[PDB]
Amino acid sequence: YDYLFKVVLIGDSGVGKSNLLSRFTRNEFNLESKSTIGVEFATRSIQVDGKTIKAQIWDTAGQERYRAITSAYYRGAVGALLVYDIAKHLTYENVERWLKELRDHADSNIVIMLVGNKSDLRHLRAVPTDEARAFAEKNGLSFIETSALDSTNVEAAFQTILTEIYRI
Ligand SMILES: Nc1nc2c(ncn2[C@@H]2O[C@H](COP(=O)(O)OP(=O)(O)NP(=O)(O)O)[C@@H](O)[C@H]2O)c(=O)[nH]1
Ligand SMILES: [Mg+2]
Secondary structure, eight states: EEEEEEEEEESSSSSHHHHHHHHHHHHHOOOOOOOOOEEEEEEEEEETEEEEEEEEEEOOOOSSSSSSOOOOHHHHHHEEEEEEEEOOHHHHHTTHHHHHHHHHHHHHOOOEEEEEEEEGGGGOSSOHHHHHHHHHHHOOEEEOOOOOOTTTTTHHHHHHHHHHHOOO
């Protein structure tokens, strides 16, 4: 590979972070996945502007009550996938909180992609696509909706953020 880019997954418990990771790196999905224990990471190489980018994707539980995610989790990260669940409005309301965590614990110029996951649950949607896109636009974030379940836009989400990082 030509470059190694560390990218972190963050977002509330249950939004689909671990399945976004497994879908992208192993093409695997699990309806019966449990809350993540400690910290995990996995890799996949992809082509970006004629270069081979080894994407090192980090993952951890969204809940931070007794245990808060430290600057060590974010160290070296050049991107963050900030994931919410399109069918749960609270997870979108908490995006502001995750942005604060990034400001507190992550690099100043970390590339942020706001990810509305579970787009296959369109019939249960609680967060309008236009509102989220507008919010992203107004806060200097990229935006995409994904479904780890049916694979829609998962490759595109990672390919796009890794492209934006490469092109900084
Ligand atoms: N319908 C649907 N379900 C999904 C999707 N992505 C994940 N899920 C489901 O949502 C639940 C939680 O997914 P998971 O990946 O474990 O979430 P998490 O964000 O890693 N949770 P935690 O922060 O606690 O580790 C699981 O039942 C999983 O199968 C998706 O795109 N669509
Ligand atoms: Mg998880």
